[PDB]
């Protein structure tokens, strides 16, 4: 495995997808299941979208990549109250994100 400019970004996305608590985040929610989601969440995003932005070389700075992941968490907590399985999973995954990002040199 070689070392490349986007290796850290790609690695973090892979680590998040593989974590058990990533299920609320893999793809955007369906408007069929959640009719009011897109009237509430102004800038929807998910791990599939973020992965593709990494693949398509769309991030110029680590801060832009980090901001997209923070947006993903922000939307989740905005729509899902603290007592939901989504928010509980999101809380753990967000900690994992901070810890793993640090290890990869992303601040």
Author numbering: 1430 to 1536
Please share text taken word for word from the publication where this structure appeared:
The C-terminal regions of BAZ1A and BAZ1B each contain one BD of unknown function. Both BAZ1A-BD and BAZ1B-BD bear a conserved asparagine “anchor” residue that, in functional BDs, hydrogen bonds with the carbonyl group of a bound acyl-lysine ligand and is required for this interaction. However, the BAZ1A-BD gatekeeper is a non-canonical glutamic acid. We confirmed that this non-canonical feature is compatible with the BD fold by solving the crystal structure of BAZ1A-BD to 1.7 Å resolution. We could not detect BAZ1A-BD binding to any of the peptides on the array. To test whether the glutamic acid gatekeeper inhibits the binding of BAZ1A-BD to acetylated peptides, we replaced it with a valine like in BAZ1B-BD. Unlike the wild-type domain, BAZ1A-BDE1515V showed substantial binding to the array that was dependent on peptide acetylation. To test whether the weak binding of wild-type BAZ1A-BD to acetylated peptides was mediated by the canonical BD pocket, we replaced the asparagine anchor with a tyrosine residue (N1509Y; BDNY) to completely abrogate acetyl-lysine recognition. The binding signal for the BAZ1A-BDNY mutant was indistinguishable from background and that observed for wild-type and unmodified peptides. We conclude that, while the BDs of BAZ1A and BAZ1B are both compatible with canonical BD function, the presence of a glutamic acid at the gatekeeper position substantially lowers the binding affinity of BAZ1A-BD to acetylated histone peptides. Moreover, the complete elimination of acetyl-lysine recognition by removal of the asparagine anchor is highly detrimental to the function of BAZ1A in cells. Together, the data suggest that BAZ1A-BD has evolved to bind acetylated histones with a specific affinity, and either increasing or decreasing the affinity of this interaction prevents BAZ1A from functioning in DNA damage recovery.
